[PDB]
Structure 1
């Protein structure tokens, strides 16, 4: 048949399957990396954690917050890690 395909180069873009698209601690969009990681150049090691209250944050920011106190900064409920991004 006329106009058959020989070679293709697909391109796709990935993003975190989250909501509100904002860490709400540093107010940086989730698809990016946190400021400290971005400055220190340790990229791809900055991930997203979820919670039983259905709130998403950076792993680094949430680690600092739990080092401060154990409660979600958005809803005043005890922080229980539901799942980790990767």
Structure 2
């Protein structure tokens, strides 16, 4: 998303899955779970 049109960093979860911060931000506005393990998402590390 920043590639096609623009700081991009990593955003880890309690499962330590490390998606893009912007990608997980866009994902969280529709789904409340982690994309990979399908568990409740909680932010951790940045």
Bigger Cα Rg: 1
Gaps of 5+ in 1: 1-35
| Structure (1/2) with the larger strand percentage | 1
Gaps of 5+ in 2: none
Over 6 Å off, 4+ runs: none
| TM-score, structure 2 as length reference | 0.88
| 1:56 to 2:21 alignment | no
The alignment yields a C-alpha RMSD, in angstroms, of: 0.9
Larger relative contact order (CA 8 Å, sep ≥ 6): 2
